[PDB]
Coordinates of N, CA and C in Angstrom, one line a residue:
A1 N -18.8 22.1 -11.5 CA -18.2 23.3 -12.1 C -18.3 23.1 -13.6
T2 N -18.4 24.2 -14.3 CA -18.5 24.2 -15.7 C -17.2 24.7 -16.3
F3 N -16.7 23.9 -17.3 CA -15.5 24.3 -18.0 C -15.9 24.4 -19.5
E4 N -15.6 25.6 -20.1 CA -15.8 25.7 -21.5 C -14.5 25.6 -22.1
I5 N -14.3 24.7 -23.1 CA -13.0 24.4 -23.7 C -13.2 24.9 -25.1
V6 N -12.3 25.9 -25.5 CA -12.5 26.6 -26.8 C -11.2 26.4 -27.6
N7 N -11.4 25.9 -28.9 CA -10.2 25.8 -29.8 C -10.2 27.0 -30.6
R8 N -9.3 28.0 -30.4 CA -9.0 29.1 -31.2 C -7.9 28.9 -32.2
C9 N -7.3 27.7 -32.2 CA -6.2 27.4 -33.1 C -6.9 27.2 -34.5
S10 N -6.0 27.4 -35.5 CA -6.4 27.2 -36.9 C -6.5 25.8 -37.3
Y11 N -6.0 24.8 -36.5 CA -6.1 23.4 -36.7 C -7.0 22.7 -35.7
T12 N -7.5 21.6 -36.1 CA -8.3 20.7 -35.2 C -7.4 20.2 -34.1
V13 N -8.0 20.2 -32.9 CA -7.4 19.5 -31.7 C -8.5 18.6 -31.2
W14 N -8.0 17.6 -30.4 CA -8.8 16.7 -29.7 C -8.6 16.9 -28.3
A15 N -9.6 17.6 -27.6 CA -9.5 18.0 -26.2 C -9.6 16.7 -25.4
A16 N -9.0 16.7 -24.2 CA -9.1 15.6 -23.3 C -9.2 16.2 -21.9
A17 N -10.0 15.4 -21.0 CA -10.2 15.8 -19.7 C -10.2 14.6 -18.8
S18 N -9.3 14.5 -17.8 CA -9.2 13.3 -17.0 C -8.7 13.7 -15.6
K19 N -9.0 12.8 -14.6 CA -8.3 12.9 -13.3 C -7.4 11.8 -13.1
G20 N -7.0 11.1 -14.1 CA -5.9 10.1 -14.1 C -6.3 8.7 -13.9
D21 N -7.4 8.5 -13.2 CA -8.0 7.2 -13.0 C -9.4 7.1 -13.6
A22 N -9.9 8.2 -14.2 CA -11.3 8.3 -14.8 C -11.3 9.5 -15.7
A23 N -12.2 9.4 -16.7 CA -12.6 10.5 -17.5 C -13.3 11.6 -16.6
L24 N -13.1 12.9 -17.0 CA -14.0 13.9 -16.6 C -15.0 14.1 -17.7
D25 N -16.3 14.2 -17.4 CA -17.3 14.3 -18.4 C -17.1 13.1 -19.5
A26 N -17.3 13.4 -20.7 CA -17.0 12.4 -21.8 C -15.5 12.1 -21.9
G27 N -14.6 12.9 -21.4 CA -13.2 12.5 -21.4 C -12.5 13.0 -22.7
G28 N -13.1 13.3 -23.8 CA -12.5 13.8 -25.0 C -13.4 14.1 -26.1
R29 N -13.0 15.0 -27.0 CA -13.9 15.3 -28.1 C -13.0 16.0 -29.1
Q30 N -13.4 15.9 -30.4 CA -12.8 16.7 -31.4 C -13.3 18.1 -31.4
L31 N -12.4 19.1 -31.5 CA -12.8 20.5 -31.6 C -12.1 21.0 -32.9
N32 N -13.0 21.3 -33.9 CA -12.5 22.0 -35.1 C -12.2 23.5 -34.7
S33 N -11.5 24.2 -35.5 CA -11.2 25.6 -35.3 C -12.4 26.4 -35.0
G34 N -12.4 27.0 -33.8 CA -13.5 27.8 -33.4 C -14.5 27.1 -32.5
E35 N -14.6 25.8 -32.4 CA -15.6 25.1 -31.7 C -15.3 25.2 -30.2
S36 N -16.4 25.1 -29.4 CA -16.4 25.2 -28.0 C -17.1 23.9 -27.5
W37 N -16.6 23.3 -26.4 CA -17.1 22.1 -25.7 C -17.3 22.5 -24.3
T38 N -18.5 22.3 -23.7 CA -18.8 22.6 -22.3 C -18.9 21.3 -21.6
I39 N -18.1 21.2 -20.5 CA -18.1 20.0 -19.7 C -18.5 20.4 -18.3
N40 N -19.0 19.4 -17.6 CA -19.3 19.5 -16.2 C -18.3 18.6 -15.4
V41 N -17.7 19.2 -14.4 CA -16.7 18.6 -13.5 C -17.3 18.5 -12.1
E42 N -17.3 17.3 -11.5 CA -17.9 17.2 -10.2 C -17.2 18.0 -9.2
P43 N -17.9 18.8 -8.3 CA -17.3 19.4 -7.2 C -16.4 18.4 -6.4
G44 N -15.3 19.0 -5.9 CA -14.4 18.2 -5.0 C -13.4 17.4 -5.9
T45 N -13.4 17.6 -7.2 CA -12.4 16.9 -8.0 C -11.0 17.4 -7.7
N46 N -10.1 16.4 -7.4 CA -8.8 16.7 -7.1 C -7.9 16.1 -8.2
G47 N -7.0 17.0 -8.7 CA -6.0 16.4 -9.6 C -6.5 16.3 -11.1
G48 N -7.5 17.1 -11.5 CA -8.0 17.1 -12.8 C -7.0 17.8 -13.8
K49 N -7.0 17.4 -15.0 CA -6.2 18.0 -16.1 C -7.0 18.0 -17.4
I50 N -6.8 19.1 -18.1 CA -7.3 19.3 -19.5 C -6.1 19.6 -20.3
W51 N -6.1 18.9 -21.5 CA -5.1 19.1 -22.5 C -5.6 19.0 -23.9
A52 N -4.8 19.4 -24.9 CA -5.1 19.2 -26.3 C -4.2 18.1 -26.8
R53 N -4.8 17.3 -27.8 CA -4.0 16.4 -28.5 C -4.0 16.8 -30.0
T54 N -3.0 16.6 -30.7 CA -2.8 16.9 -32.1 C -2.6 15.7 -33.0
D55 N -3.0 15.9 -34.2 CA -2.8 14.9 -35.3 C -3.3 13.5 -34.9
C56 N -4.6 13.4 -34.6 CA -5.2 12.2 -34.2 C -6.0 11.6 -35.3
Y57 N -6.0 10.2 -35.3 CA -6.9 9.4 -36.1 C -7.7 8.5 -35.2
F58 N -9.0 8.5 -35.4 CA -9.8 7.6 -34.6 C -10.8 6.9 -35.6
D59 N -11.0 5.6 -35.3 CA -12.0 4.9 -36.0 C -13.4 5.1 -35.4
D60 N -14.4 4.3 -35.9 CA -15.7 4.4 -35.4 C -15.9 4.1 -33.9
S61 N -15.1 3.2 -33.4 CA -15.2 2.8 -32.0 C -14.5 3.8 -31.0
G62 N -13.9 4.8 -31.5 CA -13.2 5.8 -30.7 C -11.8 5.4 -30.3
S63 N -11.2 4.5 -31.1 CA -9.9 3.9 -31.0 C -9.0 4.5 -32.1
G64 N -7.7 4.8 -31.7 CA -6.8 5.3 -32.7 C -5.5 5.8 -32.0
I65 N -5.0 6.9 -32.5 CA -3.7 7.4 -32.1 C -3.6 8.9 -32.3
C66 N -2.8 9.6 -31.5 CA -2.6 11.0 -31.7 C -1.0 11.2 -31.6
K67 N -0.5 12.2 -32.2 CA 0.9 12.5 -32.2 C 1.4 13.2 -30.9
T68 N 0.5 14.0 -30.2 CA 0.8 14.5 -28.9 C -0.4 14.2 -28.0
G69 N -0.1 13.9 -26.8 CA -1.1 13.7 -25.7 C -2.0 12.5 -25.8
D70 N -1.6 11.5 -26.6 CA -2.4 10.3 -26.7 C -2.6 9.7 -25.3
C71 N -3.8 9.2 -25.1 CA -4.2 8.6 -23.8 C -4.6 7.2 -24.0
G72 N -3.6 6.3 -24.3 CA -3.8 4.9 -24.6 C -4.7 4.6 -25.8
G73 N -4.7 5.5 -26.8 CA -5.4 5.2 -28.1 C -6.9 5.5 -28.0
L74 N -7.4 6.2 -27.0 CA -8.8 6.4 -26.9 C -9.2 7.8 -27.2
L75 N -10.3 8.0 -27.9 CA -10.9 9.4 -28.1 C -11.3 9.9 -26.7
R76 N -12.0 9.1 -25.9 CA -12.5 9.5 -24.6 C -11.5 9.1 -23.6
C77 N -10.6 10.0 -23.1 CA -9.6 9.6 -22.2 C -10.1 9.3 -20.8
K78 N -9.5 8.2 -20.3 CA -9.7 7.8 -18.9 C -8.4 8.1 -18.1
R79 N -7.2 8.1 -18.8 CA -6.0 8.4 -18.2 C -5.3 9.6 -18.8
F80 N -4.2 10.0 -18.2 CA -3.4 11.1 -18.7 C -2.7 10.8 -20.0
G81 N -2.4 11.8 -20.7 CA -1.8 11.7 -22.0 C -0.3 11.7 -22.0
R82 N 0.2 11.1 -23.2 CA 1.6 11.0 -23.4 C 2.2 12.4 -23.7
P83 N 3.3 12.8 -23.1 CA 4.0 14.1 -23.4 C 4.4 14.1 -24.8
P84 N 4.6 15.3 -25.4 CA 4.5 16.6 -24.8 C 3.0 17.1 -24.7
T85 N 2.6 17.6 -23.6 CA 1.3 18.2 -23.4 C 1.3 19.4 -22.5
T86 N 0.9 20.5 -23.0 CA 0.7 21.7 -22.1 C -0.5 21.3 -21.2
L87 N -0.4 21.5 -19.9 CA -1.5 21.1 -19.0 C -2.2 22.2 -18.3
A88 N -3.6 22.2 -18.3 CA -4.4 22.9 -17.4 C -4.7 22.0 -16.2
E89 N -4.3 22.4 -15.0 CA -4.5 21.6 -13.9 C -5.3 22.2 -12.8
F90 N -6.2 21.4 -12.2 CA -7.1 22.0 -11.2 C -7.5 21.0 -10.1
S91 N -7.7 21.6 -8.9 CA -8.3 20.9 -7.8 C -9.4 21.8 -7.3
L92 N -10.6 21.2 -7.2 CA -11.8 22.0 -6.9 C -12.3 21.7 -5.5
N93 N -12.8 22.8 -4.8 CA -13.5 22.7 -3.5 C -12.6 22.0 -2.5
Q94 N -11.4 22.6 -2.4 CA -10.4 22.0 -1.4 C -10.4 23.0 -0.3
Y95 N -11.2 22.6 0.8 CA -11.3 23.5 1.9 C -11.8 24.9 1.6
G96 N -12.8 25.0 0.7 CA -13.4 26.3 0.3 C -12.8 27.0 -0.9
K97 N -11.7 26.4 -1.5 CA -11.0 27.1 -2.5 C -10.8 26.2 -3.7
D98 N -10.7 26.8 -4.8 CA -10.2 26.1 -6.0 C -8.8 26.5 -6.4
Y99 N -8.0 25.6 -6.9 CA -6.6 25.8 -7.3 C -6.4 25.5 -8.7
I100 N -5.9 26.5 -9.5 CA -5.7 26.3 -10.9 C -4.2 26.6 -11.3
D101 N -3.7 26.0 -12.3 CA -2.4 26.3 -12.8 C -2.3 25.8 -14.2
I102 N -1.3 26.3 -14.9 CA -0.8 25.7 -16.1 C 0.6 25.2 -15.8
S103 N 0.9 24.0 -16.4 CA 2.2 23.3 -16.2 C 2.8 23.0 -17.6
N104 N 4.1 23.2 -17.7 CA 5.0 22.6 -18.7 C 5.9 21.5 -18.2
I105 N 5.5 20.9 -17.0 CA 6.4 19.8 -16.5 C 6.4 18.6 -17.4
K106 N 5.3 18.4 -18.2 CA 5.2 17.3 -19.2 C 5.3 17.9 -20.6
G107 N 6.0 19.0 -20.7 CA 6.3 19.6 -22.0 C 5.2 20.5 -22.5
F108 N 5.3 20.8 -23.7 CA 4.4 21.8 -24.4 C 4.0 21.4 -25.8
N109 N 2.7 21.4 -26.1 CA 2.3 21.1 -27.4 C 1.5 22.3 -28.1
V110 N 0.5 22.8 -27.3 CA -0.4 23.8 -27.8 C -0.4 25.0 -26.8
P111 N -0.4 26.2 -27.3 CA -0.5 27.3 -26.3 C -1.9 27.4 -25.7
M112 N -2.0 27.9 -24.5 CA -3.2 27.8 -23.7 C -3.4 29.0 -22.8
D113 N -4.7 29.4 -22.6 CA -5.1 30.3 -21.6 C -6.1 29.5 -20.7
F114 N -5.9 29.7 -19.4 CA -6.9 29.0 -18.4 C -7.4 30.1 -17.4
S115 N -8.6 30.5 -17.6 CA -9.2 31.7 -16.9 C -10.5 31.3 -16.3
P116 N -10.8 31.9 -15.1 CA -12.2 31.8 -14.6 C -13.1 32.6 -15.4
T117 N -14.4 32.1 -15.4 CA -15.5 32.9 -16.1 C -16.4 33.5 -15.0
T118 N -16.0 33.2 -13.7 CA -16.7 33.8 -12.6 C -15.7 34.7 -11.9
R119 N -16.2 35.5 -10.8 CA -15.4 36.5 -10.2 C -14.4 36.0 -9.2
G120 N -13.3 36.7 -9.0 CA -12.6 36.6 -7.7 C -11.2 36.1 -7.8
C121 N -10.6 35.9 -9.1 CA -9.2 35.5 -9.3 C -8.8 35.8 -10.7
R122 N -7.6 35.6 -11.0 CA -7.0 35.9 -12.3 C -6.8 34.6 -13.1
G123 N -6.6 34.7 -14.4 CA -6.3 33.6 -15.2 C -4.8 33.5 -15.3
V124 N -4.3 32.4 -16.0 CA -2.9 32.2 -16.3 C -2.8 31.8 -17.8
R125 N -1.7 32.0 -18.4 CA -1.5 31.8 -19.8 C -0.1 31.3 -20.1
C126 N 0.0 30.4 -21.1 CA 1.3 30.2 -21.7 C 1.1 30.2 -23.2
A127 N 1.5 31.3 -23.9 CA 1.1 31.4 -25.3 C 2.3 31.7 -26.2
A128 N 3.5 31.5 -25.7 CA 4.7 31.8 -26.4 C 4.9 30.7 -27.4
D129 N 5.8 30.9 -28.4 CA 6.1 29.9 -29.4 C 7.2 28.9 -28.9
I130 N 6.8 28.1 -27.9 CA 7.7 27.2 -27.3 C 8.1 26.2 -28.4
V131 N 7.3 25.7 -29.3 CA 7.7 24.7 -30.2 C 8.7 25.2 -31.2
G132 N 8.4 26.5 -31.7 CA 9.4 27.1 -32.6 C 10.8 27.2 -32.0
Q133 N 10.8 27.5 -30.7 CA 12.1 27.9 -30.1 C 12.7 26.7 -29.3
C134 N 12.1 25.6 -29.3 CA 12.4 24.4 -28.5 C 13.9 24.1 -28.8
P135 N 14.7 23.8 -27.7 CA 16.0 23.2 -27.9 C 16.0 22.0 -28.7
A136 N 17.0 21.8 -29.5 CA 17.1 20.7 -30.4 C 16.9 19.3 -29.7
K137 N 17.5 19.1 -28.5 CA 17.4 17.8 -27.9 C 16.0 17.5 -27.3
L138 N 15.2 18.6 -27.1 CA 13.8 18.4 -26.6 C 12.7 18.4 -27.7
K139 N 13.1 18.6 -28.9 CA 12.0 18.6 -29.9 C 11.5 17.2 -30.1
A140 N 10.2 17.1 -30.1 CA 9.5 15.8 -30.4 C 9.2 15.7 -31.9
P141 N 9.5 14.6 -32.6 CA 9.3 14.5 -34.0 C 7.8 14.6 -34.4
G142 N 7.0 14.1 -33.6 CA 5.5 14.1 -33.8 C 4.9 15.5 -33.6
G143 N 5.7 16.4 -33.0 CA 5.3 17.8 -32.8 C 5.5 18.0 -31.3
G144 N 5.8 19.2 -30.9 CA 5.8 19.6 -29.6 C 7.2 19.7 -29.0
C145 N 7.3 20.1 -27.8 CA 8.6 20.3 -27.1 C 8.6 19.6 -25.8
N146 N 9.3 18.5 -25.7 CA 9.3 17.6 -24.5 C 10.0 18.3 -23.3
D147 N 9.6 17.9 -22.1 CA 10.4 18.3 -21.0 C 11.6 17.3 -20.9
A148 N 12.5 17.8 -20.1 CA 13.8 17.1 -20.0 C 13.6 15.8 -19.2
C149 N 12.7 15.7 -18.3 CA 12.5 14.4 -17.6 C 12.1 13.3 -18.5
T150 N 11.1 13.6 -19.4 CA 10.6 12.7 -20.4 C 11.8 12.2 -21.2
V151 N 12.6 13.2 -21.7 CA 13.7 12.8 -22.6 C 14.9 12.0 -22.0
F152 N 15.4 12.5 -20.9 CA 16.6 12.0 -20.3 C 16.4 11.1 -19.1
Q153 N 15.3 11.2 -18.4 CA 15.0 10.2 -17.3 C 16.1 10.2 -16.2
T154 N 16.6 11.4 -15.8 CA 17.5 11.5 -14.7 C 16.7 11.9 -13.4
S155 N 17.4 11.6 -12.3 CA 16.9 12.0 -11.0 C 16.7 13.6 -10.9
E156 N 17.7 14.3 -11.5 CA 17.7 15.7 -11.5 C 16.5 16.3 -12.2
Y157 N 16.3 15.8 -13.5 CA 15.2 16.4 -14.2 C 13.8 16.0 -13.7
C158 N 13.7 14.8 -13.2 CA 12.4 14.2 -12.8 C 12.2 14.5 -11.3
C159 N 13.2 15.0 -10.6 CA 13.1 15.4 -9.2 C 12.7 14.2 -8.3
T160 N 13.3 13.1 -8.6 CA 12.9 11.8 -8.1 C 13.2 11.8 -6.6
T161 N 14.2 12.4 -6.1 CA 14.6 12.3 -4.7 C 13.9 13.4 -3.9
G162 N 13.2 14.3 -4.6 CA 12.5 15.4 -4.0 C 13.4 16.6 -3.7
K163 N 14.6 16.4 -4.2 CA 15.5 17.5 -4.2 C 16.0 17.6 -5.6
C164 N 15.8 18.8 -6.2 CA 16.3 19.1 -7.5 C 16.4 20.6 -7.6
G165 N 17.1 21.1 -8.6 CA 17.1 22.5 -8.9 C 16.6 22.8 -10.3
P166 N 16.5 24.0 -10.7 CA 16.2 24.4 -12.1 C 17.4 24.0 -12.9
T167 N 17.2 23.8 -14.2 CA 18.1 23.3 -15.2 C 18.1 24.2 -16.4
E168 N 19.1 24.0 -17.3 CA 19.1 24.7 -18.5 C 17.7 24.5 -19.3
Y169 N 17.2 23.3 -19.2 CA 16.0 23.0 -19.9 C 14.8 23.6 -19.2
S170 N 14.7 23.5 -17.9 CA 13.5 24.1 -17.2 C 13.5 25.6 -17.4
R171 N 14.7 26.3 -17.5 CA 14.8 27.7 -17.6 C 14.3 28.2 -18.9
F172 N 14.4 27.3 -20.0 CA 13.9 27.6 -21.3 C 12.4 27.8 -21.2
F173 N 11.7 26.8 -20.6 CA 10.3 26.9 -20.5 C 9.9 28.1 -19.6
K174 N 10.6 28.4 -18.6 CA 10.3 29.4 -17.6 C 10.5 30.8 -18.3
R175 N 11.5 31.0 -19.1 CA 11.8 32.2 -19.8 C 10.6 32.6 -20.7
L176 N 10.1 31.6 -21.4 CA 9.0 31.9 -22.4 C 7.7 31.9 -21.7
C177 N 7.5 31.2 -20.6 CA 6.2 31.1 -19.9 C 6.4 31.2 -18.4
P178 N 6.6 32.4 -17.9 CA 6.9 32.5 -16.5 C 5.7 32.1 -15.5
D179 N 4.5 32.1 -16.1 CA 3.4 31.8 -15.2 C 3.0 30.3 -15.3
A180 N 3.8 29.5 -15.8 CA 3.6 28.0 -15.8 C 4.7 27.3 -15.1
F181 N 4.3 26.2 -14.4 CA 5.4 25.3 -13.8 C 6.3 24.9 -14.8
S182 N 7.7 25.0 -14.5 CA 8.7 24.6 -15.5 C 9.5 23.3 -15.0
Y183 N 9.4 23.0 -13.7 CA 9.9 21.8 -13.1 C 9.2 21.5 -11.8
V184 N 9.4 20.3 -11.3 CA 8.6 19.9 -10.2 C 8.6 20.8 -9.0
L185 N 9.8 21.4 -8.6 CA 9.9 22.2 -7.4 C 10.0 23.7 -7.8
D186 N 9.5 24.1 -8.9 CA 9.4 25.5 -9.3 C 8.6 26.2 -8.3
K187 N 8.9 27.5 -8.1 CA 8.1 28.3 -7.2 C 6.7 28.3 -7.8
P188 N 5.7 27.9 -6.9 CA 4.3 27.7 -7.5 C 3.8 28.9 -8.2
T189 N 3.1 28.7 -9.3 CA 2.3 29.7 -10.0 C 0.8 29.3 -9.9
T190 N 0.5 28.6 -8.9 CA -0.9 28.3 -8.7 C -1.7 29.5 -8.4
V191 N -2.9 29.6 -8.9 CA -3.9 30.7 -8.5 C -5.0 30.1 -7.7
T192 N -5.3 30.8 -6.6 CA -6.4 30.4 -5.7 C -7.6 31.2 -6.1
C193 N -8.7 30.5 -6.4 CA -10.0 31.0 -6.8 C -11.0 30.6 -5.8
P194 N -12.1 31.3 -5.7 CA -13.2 30.9 -4.8 C -13.7 29.5 -5.2
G195 N -14.0 28.7 -4.1 CA -14.6 27.4 -4.4 C -15.8 27.5 -5.3
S196 N -15.9 26.5 -6.2 CA -17.1 26.4 -7.1 C -17.1 27.5 -8.2
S197 N -15.9 28.0 -8.6 CA -15.7 28.8 -9.7 C -16.0 28.0 -11.0
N198 N -16.2 28.7 -12.1 CA -16.3 28.1 -13.4 C -15.2 28.7 -14.3
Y199 N -14.8 28.0 -15.4 CA -13.6 28.3 -16.1 C -13.8 28.1 -17.6
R200 N -12.8 28.7 -18.3 CA -12.7 28.5 -19.7 C -11.2 28.2 -20.0
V201 N -11.0 27.2 -20.8 CA -9.7 26.8 -21.3 C -9.7 27.1 -22.8
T202 N -8.8 28.0 -23.2 CA -8.7 28.4 -24.7 C -7.4 27.9 -25.2
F203 N -7.5 27.1 -26.2 CA -6.3 26.7 -27.0 C -6.0 27.8 -28.0
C204 N -4.7 28.2 -28.2 CA -4.2 29.2 -29.1 C -4.9 30.5 -28.8
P205 N -4.8 31.1 -27.6 CA -5.5 32.3 -27.2 C -5.2 33.5 -28.0
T206 N -4.0 33.6 -28.5 CA -3.5 34.8 -29.3 C -3.5 34.5 -30.7

C-alpha cells in the first residue's frame, strides 16, 4: 500500500512510520512545509502508526532528539514515539479489509487528516486547536497536549484492568475531535476500507 505523507504545516516536522518492532519504509524523514513523502507499506501490516515529531535535532548519523514523538533518538524510527503524538493507525489486509483511525490516546501534538486516495471509504480528521485549549495539567512543556494516562499513570486513565470509563480529560479530547479515539474503551471511530487501499496523511490539513 502507498501512503503519501504531506506536511501542510508552516513549520518543519519529522514524519515517522513504525509498527512498533520495526520501521515502515525508511521509518522517518524531515518534511519541510509543503513537502510530501511517499512510503510503501507491506500488505498485511498490522498495528502500523504514522505520526509527526516536532522540534528535532539530528546529527549526521541520524541520532538526536525531538520535543514530541521522539523514537529513542533516531531519525529513522523502529519503535513508537514518546507522547504527546497524534496517531494515524492502520491495519492492512485483515480478512479482506483495511482498518484506519486517528487516536488521541497518546495525546496530541499536530493536527492531522487521514484519508484514502482510492475509492470506497471516508477519511477521518482531528484538526482542532487541542494544544491551545489543552487543560493546564495536560500541557507538555516541549509542546503538545498529553493524555491523562501518560501524565497520572492511574488504572482508570490507562484502562489497565480493561474496565474504565470516560473522564474529564478524555472528554476534552472527544469534544474537540469526535472522530478520534479519546481513551482506550471509547466507542470505536475506526473506518473500514477495502483491502489494499492507498492513503494520504496530511499534517495541518486546515
